[PDB]
Amino acid sequence: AVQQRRSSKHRRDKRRSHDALTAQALSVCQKCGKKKLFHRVCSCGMYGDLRVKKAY
Amino acid sequence: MHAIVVCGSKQYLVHENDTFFVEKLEAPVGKEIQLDKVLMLDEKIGAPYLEKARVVCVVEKHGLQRKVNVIKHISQKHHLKKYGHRQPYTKLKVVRFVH
Amino acid sequence: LNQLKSVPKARNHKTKTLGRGHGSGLGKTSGRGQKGQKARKSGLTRPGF
Amino acid sequence: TKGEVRGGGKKPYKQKHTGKARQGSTRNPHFVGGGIVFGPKPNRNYSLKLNKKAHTAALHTVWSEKLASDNTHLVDQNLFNKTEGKTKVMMQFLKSAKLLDKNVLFVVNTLNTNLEQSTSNIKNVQVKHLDKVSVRDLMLANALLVEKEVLKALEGKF
Amino acid sequence: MRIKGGKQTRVRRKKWLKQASGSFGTRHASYKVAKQTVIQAAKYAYRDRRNKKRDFRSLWILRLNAALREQGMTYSVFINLLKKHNIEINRKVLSELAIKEPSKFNLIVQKVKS
Amino acid sequence: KTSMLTKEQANKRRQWYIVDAAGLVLGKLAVKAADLIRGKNKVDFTPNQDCGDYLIIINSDQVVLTGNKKENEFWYHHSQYIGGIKKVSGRDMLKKQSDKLVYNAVKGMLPDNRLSRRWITKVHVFKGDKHNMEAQKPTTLNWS
Amino acid sequence: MIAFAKQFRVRISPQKARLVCQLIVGKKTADAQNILSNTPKKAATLIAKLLNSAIANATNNHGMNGDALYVFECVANQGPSMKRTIPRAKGSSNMITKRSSNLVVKLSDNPNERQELIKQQKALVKKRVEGQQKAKMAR
RNA sequence: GCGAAACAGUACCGUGAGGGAAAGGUGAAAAGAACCCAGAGAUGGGAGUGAAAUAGAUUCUGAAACCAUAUGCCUACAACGUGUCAGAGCACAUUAAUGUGUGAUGGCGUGCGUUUUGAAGUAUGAGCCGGCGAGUUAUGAUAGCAAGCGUUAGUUAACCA
RNA sequence: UUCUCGCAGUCAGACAGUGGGGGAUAAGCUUCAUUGUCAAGAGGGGAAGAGCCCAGAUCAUUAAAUAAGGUCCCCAAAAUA
RNA sequence: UUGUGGUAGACGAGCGUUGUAUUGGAGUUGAAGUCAAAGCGUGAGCAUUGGUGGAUCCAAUACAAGUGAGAAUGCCGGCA
């Protein structure tokens, strides 16, 4: 169904301002640069186990 | 000191060089006028409008109050009728109220 | 007179236009009222009616 | 007007089942493409009627109060004889006239061809005929000369 | 002949709608809601000019009666004493503010007796 | 013109007060408490500044029920349910919670504002005798 | 400051870009570039690349320092869109709309430039009132 | 203003009769942004032209409506067309003006037009603004008013000047 | 308030009360005469209270006392016996 | 003194839109459009200055209305 009026800016912001983003995990690399997410492979290959991957 | 005087249609308690606003009374600015509509003459009260405690005052300035733009209308009708009324005001102060 | 001093000689009478004004009247009212035959395009009626 | 607009008009939608404005044609006198009911026609009379008695009275009073104007001195054949068709002599006169600010009318009835040839090179030179004039322009020139031989002639028409 | 009405109407409605401002959200960036706000403010000012005298007089009477009952008398008896005798010229707001003045109101206390 | 009445603002000064007069009917005590916590006894009164007083009450459950109201006095408090109304007995609220009865009375005799509920918060009435503000030297009074 | 890049007609929904720009505003170069790269969106990497290009412009072209620059402004305001018909059921139809935005980015070196505009406005009002008062002496 | 300045009955909408809009302003002048910056380039930025790129080509003014932002205020026990009249608190000192703006909190306070005896209305229709939109032209009479006129006053028609 | 001019708006009102009619003598029901109100014109109060009391409201005042009504508190104001 | 409750309804007088008929004055040392502000009036209005801005306007007297815009589920641009 629908009402007989419109929804102003304030109602939307009360809906939108609580849709705001949040923070994330982080992982400083202990052997290289290219700071990466936690529990994620750094973007320069050399990972803890080994260079499980590449830089690109 | 202190004295309640009557001027225009309002009362005011006046002290040394007391500045306040009163209703306009078709009087010039700067004149030293002695009012006889005064009471509370130094903690003394008079039924016949106690006098001989003269209060000489000087008008600080005159002016026009904010515009009273009355829109006389009826609800559920437009009936817009605007007219700007102005009630003149008067700023004044006592000089030394020589008694 | 002239094109900068043409003072009037007092011949100009009030003109009534029924479709103008809200604080000057002649609004929706238009000097006729709004009901019945008077609220339609029923002007210019035969005087024999 | 509404019915004199080129272009087909009809109801573009249905009467019911449409909560918008209902129109029997595309154009109405609330449109910005045509259809306004009330407008001008090339027949507005704007006709004022002036009586012959009133016309003569106006002529007489305007002439009489122009007699008292700044430019009231009389003219004759003399300046026509002296002047040529050249605007040179006309602007020499203007220099000697000292009345450049006035739009002086060279009102003549003899029609000296030098005046018609000349008298358009400055913002004050203008020559017209005598018998074909109007009171509006007669009092509007703010100054203009009169002829000496037409006194009884102007008296005749009053 | 086509009469110009583009800018002139803009200026007219700009003058008309200027009085509407300082409202919650957006009640001043339109015409009808702006008229609503302006007319409500005008009627509020009209009713103030009509009745703030009685409002302030009632407030002064209430406060003055509270002070009287602090001193040990009611407004009815006090005004009766002021009326039937003790011809004194003083207003309610000034009477209630005279308490702040040291002993000036107490002077009224011993003088207002019939 | 206008006297330009200005309110006395930005001042924190209220004394401490106590009363032990349980035994009299609800109405007079409730109206006196409402006047005391409202600011009806100030020569220099200010409605939008500290005006209400601080009254603590000791042994407020000694009130007796007068007249024929013994098995007649009850109050309505309806929770938004099916038959959620609560009907508590007057003859039992005397021994049971009675300070909240005075709270309800004074809150019913006050003008409904945020200041009204703040005045309600500014009242410390309890059935017992051991409290905390008695150490603040509460000036004993009665019916203010 | 410098490193500004106006981008009108960026065809994208403004419902999402302005919010993320507001979240991003108030961060340095690398600590924002890495998080933009660590996004599943389709705009953050391009915003980081544009920021790098703008920093290059500021440092090389204007000869700026590029030692304290941070994100001073990011917003996705109204953008002209393409609105055409779209079929529906029961023989009805609607108007589909593919929107755009007006991308604009500004950077600031100092935490200031919120009050420099205030000082400019103060100078403007002072010179305005000076004209007004020299007019008043003409009364 | 011709629907039709703008490549108009054009694109387009119907088989067919038929219907059908919008689209001018650079700079006096391209002297149209050479060289460089990041990039894949668009692009944006310098550099330069230039009176100026709020003169840089969606280049004649460039608003309202709208989209957002933070600077000074205060605000997350909160029952309010949310404002009035009072007034704390905060920042400035003027179109010198009962200083200017914001506003802790209190007495008070159901939007608009409609026909409606009566709608805040559970009747009505409207989000917004921009432009635009409704008592009309001629002819004839009546009446009021203003002007002339005179003791058959005046006006012309057609036609001519 | 008698006479001439004409622009009007108006025969779809309601209500408060009295005498009525139909009606249970109900009607937020209808129709008469009849005193007024809103309509054509508002305030306070009556818990909000259209026909209820003061009732007649150029404007401005933070001035005086009253009318109906109210005076334990809030919504004002009062007690004495 | 009557005074100003007052709907429709009747009565009177002004301001304003541009344009015209003009005497006058103002424009690259800026004319206008544009928007802000702690003025002026009794009302239709005058604005004062500033700036974006870039070549035409403004005061006064007479006349013309397609002459004063909130409602027509009014047309419609833009935009929620």
CSV table of N, CA, C and O (backbone and C1' of nucleotides) in Angstrom, one decimal, chain E residues 2-7 9-10 13-14 17 22-24 26-33 36 39-40 43-45 47-48 52 55-56, chain H residues 1 63-67 81-87 101-103 106-113 125-133:
chain,number,residue,atom,x,y,z
E,2,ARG,N,2.9,42.5,-26.8
E,2,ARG,CA,3.1,41.5,-25.8
E,2,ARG,C,3.7,42.1,-24.5
E,2,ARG,O,4.8,42.6,-24.6
E,3,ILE,N,3.0,42.0,-23.4
E,3,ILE,CA,3.5,42.7,-22.2
E,3,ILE,C,4.4,41.7,-21.4
E,3,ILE,O,4.1,40.5,-21.3
E,4,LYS,N,5.5,42.2,-21.0
E,4,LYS,CA,6.5,41.5,-20.3
E,4,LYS,C,6.1,41.2,-18.9
E,4,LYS,O,5.6,42.1,-18.2
E,5,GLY,N,6.2,40.0,-18.4
E,5,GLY,CA,5.8,39.6,-17.1
E,5,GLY,C,6.7,38.6,-16.4
E,5,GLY,O,6.4,38.0,-15.4
E,6,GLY,N,7.8,38.3,-17.1
E,6,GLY,CA,8.8,37.3,-16.6
E,6,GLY,C,9.5,37.7,-15.3
E,6,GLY,O,9.3,37.1,-14.2
E,7,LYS,N,10.3,38.7,-15.4
E,7,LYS,CA,11.1,39.2,-14.2
E,7,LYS,C,10.2,39.9,-13.2
E,7,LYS,O,10.4,39.8,-12.0
E,9,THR,N,7.1,39.5,-12.3
E,9,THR,CA,6.4,38.5,-11.4
E,9,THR,C,7.4,37.9,-10.4
E,9,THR,O,7.1,37.6,-9.3
E,10,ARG,N,8.7,37.6,-10.9
E,10,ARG,CA,9.7,37.1,-10.0
E,10,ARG,C,10.0,38.0,-8.9
E,10,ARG,O,10.0,37.6,-7.7
E,13,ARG,N,6.9,38.1,-6.4
E,13,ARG,CA,6.8,36.9,-5.5
E,13,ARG,C,8.0,36.8,-4.6
E,13,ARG,O,7.8,36.3,-3.5
E,14,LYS,N,9.1,37.4,-5.0
E,14,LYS,CA,10.3,37.4,-4.1
E,14,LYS,C,9.9,38.4,-2.9
E,14,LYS,O,10.3,38.1,-1.7
E,17,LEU,N,7.3,36.5,-0.6
E,17,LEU,CA,7.8,35.4,0.1
E,17,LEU,C,8.9,35.6,1.1
E,17,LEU,O,9.4,34.7,1.7
E,22,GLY,N,13.4,31.1,8.8
E,22,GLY,CA,13.7,30.6,10.2
E,22,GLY,C,12.8,29.5,10.6
E,22,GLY,O,12.6,29.3,11.8
E,23,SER,N,12.3,28.7,9.7
E,23,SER,CA,11.3,27.6,10.0
E,23,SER,C,12.0,26.3,9.9
E,23,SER,O,13.1,26.1,9.3
E,24,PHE,N,11.4,25.2,10.5
E,24,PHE,CA,12.0,23.9,10.5
E,24,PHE,C,12.1,23.3,9.1
E,24,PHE,O,11.1,23.5,8.3
E,26,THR,N,12.1,22.8,5.6
E,26,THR,CA,11.8,23.6,4.4
E,26,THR,C,10.4,24.0,4.4
E,26,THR,O,9.5,23.3,3.9
E,27,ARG,N,10.1,25.1,5.0
E,27,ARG,CA,8.7,25.8,4.9
E,27,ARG,C,8.8,27.2,4.4
E,27,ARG,O,7.9,28.0,4.5
E,28,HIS,N,10.0,27.5,3.8
E,28,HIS,CA,10.2,28.9,3.3
E,28,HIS,C,10.7,28.9,1.9
E,28,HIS,O,10.9,30.0,1.3
E,29,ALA,N,11.1,27.7,1.3
E,29,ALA,CA,11.5,27.7,-0.1
E,29,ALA,C,10.4,27.4,-1.1
E,29,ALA,O,10.6,26.8,-2.1
E,30,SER,N,9.1,27.8,-0.7
E,30,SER,CA,8.0,27.5,-1.5
E,30,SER,C,7.0,28.7,-1.4
E,30,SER,O,7.4,29.7,-0.8
E,31,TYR,N,5.8,28.6,-2.0
E,31,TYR,CA,4.9,29.7,-1.9
E,31,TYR,C,3.8,29.5,-0.9
E,31,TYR,O,3.5,30.3,0.0
E,32,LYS,N,3.1,28.4,-1.0
E,32,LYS,CA,1.9,28.1,-0.1
E,32,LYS,C,2.3,27.9,1.3
E,32,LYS,O,1.7,28.4,2.2
E,33,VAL,N,3.4,27.0,1.5
E,33,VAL,CA,3.8,26.8,2.9
E,33,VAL,C,4.4,28.1,3.5
E,33,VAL,O,4.3,28.4,4.7
E,36,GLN,N,1.6,30.1,4.6
E,36,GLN,CA,1.1,29.5,5.8
E,36,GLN,C,1.9,30.0,7.0
E,36,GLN,O,1.4,30.5,8.0
E,39,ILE,N,1.3,33.9,7.6
E,39,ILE,CA,0.0,34.2,8.2
E,39,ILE,C,-0.1,33.7,9.6
E,39,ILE,O,-0.7,34.3,10.5
E,40,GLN,N,0.5,32.5,9.9
E,40,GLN,CA,0.5,32.1,11.3
E,40,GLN,C,1.3,33.0,12.2
E,40,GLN,O,0.9,33.3,13.3
E,43,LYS,N,-0.9,36.2,12.7
E,43,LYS,CA,-2.0,36.0,13.7
E,43,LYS,C,-1.4,35.8,15.1
E,43,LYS,O,-2.0,36.3,16.1
E,44,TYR,N,-0.2,35.2,15.2
E,44,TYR,CA,0.4,35.1,16.5
E,44,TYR,C,0.7,36.5,17.1
E,44,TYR,O,0.4,36.8,18.3
E,45,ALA,N,1.3,37.3,16.3
E,45,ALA,CA,1.6,38.7,16.7
E,45,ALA,C,0.3,39.5,17.0
E,45,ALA,O,0.3,40.2,18.0
E,47,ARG,N,-2.6,38.2,18.1
E,47,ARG,CA,-3.1,37.8,19.4
E,47,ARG,C,-2.2,38.2,20.6
E,47,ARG,O,-2.7,38.5,21.7
E,48,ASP,N,-0.9,38.3,20.4
E,48,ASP,CA,0.0,38.8,21.4
E,48,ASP,C,-0.4,40.3,21.7
E,48,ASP,O,-0.6,40.6,22.9
E,52,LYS,N,-1.4,40.0,25.5
E,52,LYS,CA,-0.3,40.0,26.4
E,52,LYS,C,-0.4,40.9,27.6
E,52,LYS,O,0.2,40.6,28.6
E,55,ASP,N,-2.2,38.7,30.0
E,55,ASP,CA,-1.3,37.7,30.4
E,55,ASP,C,-0.4,38.1,31.4
E,55,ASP,O,-0.2,37.5,32.5
E,56,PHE,N,0.3,39.3,31.2
E,56,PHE,CA,1.3,39.8,32.1
E,56,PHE,C,0.6,40.3,33.4
E,56,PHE,O,1.2,40.1,34.5
H,1,G,P,2.1,33.6,-30.9
H,1,G,O5',2.7,34.4,-32.1
H,1,G,C5',2.8,35.9,-32.0
H,1,G,C4',3.7,36.4,-33.1
H,1,G,C3',3.5,35.8,-34.5
H,1,G,O3',2.4,36.3,-35.2
H,1,G,C1',5.8,35.8,-33.9
H,63,A,P,23.3,31.6,-11.2
H,63,A,O5',22.0,31.9,-10.3
H,63,A,C5',21.8,33.2,-9.7
H,63,A,C4',20.4,33.6,-9.6
H,63,A,C3',19.5,32.5,-8.9
H,63,A,O3',19.5,32.6,-7.5
H,63,A,C1',18.5,33.2,-11.0
H,64,A,P,19.3,31.2,-6.6
H,64,A,O5',17.8,30.9,-6.7
H,64,A,C5',16.8,31.8,-6.2
H,64,A,C4',15.4,31.5,-6.7
H,64,A,C3',14.9,30.1,-6.3
H,64,A,O3',14.3,30.0,-5.0
H,64,A,C1',14.6,30.4,-8.7
H,65,A,P,14.6,28.8,-4.1
H,65,A,O5',14.1,27.5,-4.9
H,65,A,C5',12.7,27.3,-5.0
H,65,A,C4',12.5,26.0,-5.8
H,65,A,C3',13.3,24.8,-5.4
H,65,A,O3',12.7,24.1,-4.3
H,65,A,C1',13.6,25.2,-7.7
H,66,C,P,13.5,23.6,-3.1
H,66,C,O5',14.5,22.5,-3.7
H,66,C,C5',14.0,21.4,-4.4
H,66,C,C4',15.1,20.7,-5.2
H,66,C,C3',16.3,20.2,-4.5
H,66,C,O3',16.1,19.0,-3.8
H,66,C,C1',17.0,21.4,-6.4
H,67,C,P,16.8,18.7,-2.4
H,67,C,O5',18.3,18.2,-2.9
H,67,C,C5',18.5,17.2,-3.8
H,67,C,C4',19.9,17.1,-4.3
H,67,C,C3',20.9,17.2,-3.1
H,67,C,O3',21.1,15.9,-2.5
H,67,C,C1',21.6,18.6,-4.9
H,81,G,P,3.0,21.5,18.0
H,81,G,O5',3.5,21.5,16.5
H,81,G,C5',2.7,21.2,15.4
H,81,G,C4',3.0,22.1,14.2
H,81,G,C3',2.5,23.5,14.2
H,81,G,O3',3.4,24.4,13.7
H,81,G,C1',1.7,22.4,12.3
H,82,U,P,4.4,25.3,14.6
H,82,U,O5',4.7,24.3,15.8
H,82,U,C5',5.4,24.8,17.0
H,82,U,C4',6.7,24.0,17.1
H,82,U,C3',7.7,24.1,16.0
H,82,U,O3',8.5,25.3,16.0
H,82,U,C1',7.5,21.9,16.6
H,83,G,P,9.6,25.6,14.9
H,83,G,O5',9.4,27.1,14.4
H,83,G,C5',9.4,28.2,15.3
H,83,G,C4',8.1,28.9,15.3
H,83,G,C3',8.0,30.0,16.4
H,83,G,O3',8.6,31.3,16.0
H,83,G,C1',6.1,28.6,16.5
H,84,U,P,9.1,32.3,17.1
H,84,U,O5',7.7,32.9,17.7
H,84,U,C5',6.9,33.7,16.9
H,84,U,C4',5.5,33.9,17.6
H,84,U,C3',5.6,34.8,18.8
H,84,U,O3',5.6,36.2,18.5
H,84,U,C1',4.2,32.9,19.2
H,85,C,P,6.9,37.1,19.0
H,85,C,O5',6.6,37.4,20.5
H,85,C,C5',5.4,38.1,20.9
H,85,C,C4',5.1,37.9,22.4
H,85,C,C3',6.3,38.1,23.4
H,85,C,O3',6.4,39.4,23.8
H,85,C,C1',5.2,36.0,23.7
H,86,A,P,7.8,40.0,24.3
H,86,A,O5',8.0,39.2,25.7
H,86,A,C5',9.3,39.0,26.2
H,86,A,C4',9.2,38.0,27.4
H,86,A,C3',10.6,37.5,27.8
H,86,A,O3',11.2,38.4,28.7
H,86,A,C1',9.1,35.6,27.6
H,87,G,P,12.6,39.1,28.2
H,87,G,O5',13.7,38.0,28.5
H,87,G,C5',13.8,37.4,29.8
H,87,G,C4',14.3,35.9,29.6
H,87,G,C3',15.5,35.7,28.8
H,87,G,O3',16.7,36.0,29.5
H,87,G,C1',13.9,34.1,28.2
H,101,G,P,18.9,40.4,12.8
H,101,G,O5',19.3,39.1,13.6
H,101,G,C5',19.0,37.8,13.2
H,101,G,C4',20.2,36.9,13.1
H,101,G,C3',20.1,35.6,13.8
H,101,G,O3',19.4,34.6,13.1
H,101,G,C1',22.1,36.7,14.4
H,102,U,P,18.2,33.9,13.7
H,102,U,O5',18.8,32.7,14.6
H,102,U,C5',19.8,31.9,14.0
H,102,U,C4',20.5,31.0,15.0
H,102,U,C3',19.7,30.3,16.1
H,102,U,O3',19.1,29.1,15.6
H,102,U,C1',21.5,31.4,17.1
H,103,G,P,17.8,28.5,16.2
H,103,G,O5',18.0,28.5,17.8
H,103,G,C5',18.8,27.4,18.4
H,103,G,C4',19.1,27.8,19.8
H,103,G,C3',18.0,27.5,20.8
H,103,G,O3',18.6,27.1,22.1
H,103,G,C1',18.5,29.8,20.8
H,106,G,P,9.9,23.2,29.1
H,106,G,O5',9.3,24.2,30.2
H,106,G,C5',8.0,24.5,30.4
H,106,G,C4',7.7,25.9,30.9
H,106,G,C3',6.5,26.6,30.4
H,106,G,O3',5.3,26.2,31.1
H,106,G,C1',8.4,28.0,30.2
H,107,G,P,3.9,26.1,30.3
H,107,G,O5',3.3,27.5,30.3
H,107,G,C5',2.5,27.9,31.4
H,107,G,C4',1.6,29.1,31.0
H,107,G,C3',0.8,28.8,29.7
H,107,G,O3',-0.4,28.1,29.8
H,107,G,C1',1.9,30.9,29.6
H,108,C,P,-0.7,26.9,28.9
H,108,C,O5',-1.1,27.6,27.5
H,108,C,C5',-2.1,28.6,27.5
H,108,C,C4',-2.1,29.4,26.2
H,108,C,C3',-2.0,28.5,24.9
H,108,C,O3',-3.3,28.1,24.5
H,108,C,C1',-0.3,30.1,24.8
H,109,G,P,-3.5,26.5,24.2
H,109,G,O5',-3.5,26.4,22.6
H,109,G,C5',-4.3,27.2,21.8
H,109,G,C4',-3.6,27.7,20.6
H,109,G,C3',-3.0,26.7,19.6
H,109,G,O3',-4.0,26.2,18.7
H,109,G,C1',-1.3,28.1,20.1
H,110,U,P,-3.7,24.8,18.0
H,110,U,O5',-5.1,24.4,17.4
H,110,U,C5',-5.4,24.7,16.0
H,110,U,C4',-5.0,23.5,15.1
H,110,U,C3',-5.8,23.4,13.8
H,110,U,O3',-5.2,24.3,12.8
H,110,U,C1',-5.7,21.3,14.9
H,111,G,P,-5.8,24.3,11.3
H,111,G,O5',-5.0,25.4,10.6
H,111,G,C5',-3.6,25.3,10.5
H,111,G,C4',-3.1,25.7,9.1
H,111,G,C3',-4.1,26.0,8.1
H,111,G,O3',-4.8,27.2,8.2
H,111,G,C1',-2.4,24.7,7.1
H,112,C,P,-6.2,27.5,7.6
H,112,C,O5',-6.0,27.4,6.0
H,112,C,C5',-5.2,28.4,5.4
H,112,C,C4',-4.9,27.9,4.0
H,112,C,C3',-6.0,27.9,2.9
H,112,C,O3',-6.2,29.2,2.4
H,112,C,C1',-4.6,26.0,2.8
H,113,G,P,-7.5,30.1,2.7
H,113,G,O5',-8.6,29.5,1.8
H,113,G,C5',-9.3,30.3,0.9
H,113,G,C4',-9.8,29.6,-0.4
H,113,G,C3',-11.1,28.9,-0.3
H,113,G,O3',-12.2,29.7,-0.5
H,113,G,C1',-9.5,27.5,-1.2
H,125,G,P,-9.8,15.1,-5.1
H,125,G,O5',-8.5,15.6,-5.8
H,125,G,C5',-8.5,16.5,-6.9
H,125,G,C4',-7.6,17.7,-6.7
H,125,G,C3',-6.3,17.4,-6.1
H,125,G,O3',-5.3,16.8,-7.0
H,125,G,C1',-7.2,19.2,-5.0
H,126,A,P,-4.0,16.1,-6.5
H,126,A,O5',-3.0,17.2,-6.3
H,126,A,C5',-2.7,18.2,-7.3
H,126,A,C4',-2.1,19.4,-6.7
H,126,A,C3',-0.9,19.2,-5.8
H,126,A,O3',0.3,19.0,-6.4
H,126,A,C1',-2.4,20.8,-4.8
H,127,G,P,1.1,17.7,-6.1
H,127,G,O5',2.3,18.2,-5.1
H,127,G,C5',2.0,18.7,-3.8
H,127,G,C4',3.2,19.3,-3.2
H,127,G,C3',3.9,20.5,-3.9
H,127,G,O3',3.3,21.7,-3.5
H,127,G,C1',5.5,18.9,-3.6
H,128,C,P,3.3,23.0,-4.5
H,128,C,O5',4.9,23.3,-4.8
H,128,C,C5',5.7,23.8,-3.7
H,128,C,C4',7.1,24.0,-4.2
H,128,C,C3',7.2,24.7,-5.5
H,128,C,O3',7.2,26.1,-5.4
H,128,C,C1',8.5,22.7,-5.6
H,129,C,P,5.9,26.9,-5.7
H,129,C,O5',6.4,28.2,-6.5
H,129,C,C5',7.5,28.9,-6.0
H,129,C,C4',8.7,28.7,-6.9
H,129,C,C3',8.5,29.0,-8.4
H,129,C,O3',8.6,30.4,-8.7
H,129,C,C1',9.5,26.9,-8.2
H,130,G,P,7.9,31.0,-10.0
H,130,G,O5',9.1,31.8,-10.7
H,130,G,C5',10.3,31.2,-10.8
H,130,G,C4',10.7,31.0,-12.3
H,130,G,C3',9.6,31.3,-13.2
H,130,G,O3',9.5,32.7,-13.5
H,130,G,C1',10.4,29.2,-13.7
H,131,G,P,8.1,33.4,-13.5
H,131,G,O5',7.7,33.7,-15.0
H,131,G,C5',8.7,33.8,-16.0
H,131,G,C4',8.3,33.1,-17.2
H,131,G,C3',6.8,33.2,-17.6
H,131,G,O3',6.5,34.4,-18.3
H,131,G,C1',7.4,31.0,-17.7
H,132,C,P,5.3,35.4,-17.8
H,132,C,O5',4.0,34.6,-18.4
H,132,C,C5',3.9,34.2,-19.7
H,132,C,C4',2.9,33.0,-19.8
H,132,C,C3',1.5,33.3,-19.3
H,132,C,O3',0.7,34.0,-20.1
H,132,C,C1',2.3,31.2,-18.5
H,133,G,P,-0.2,35.2,-19.6
H,133,G,O5',-1.6,34.5,-19.1
H,133,G,C5',-2.3,33.7,-20.1
H,133,G,C4',-3.2,32.7,-19.4
H,133,G,C3',-4.1,33.4,-18.3
H,133,G,O3',-5.3,34.0,-18.9
H,133,G,C1',-3.1,31.5,-17.4
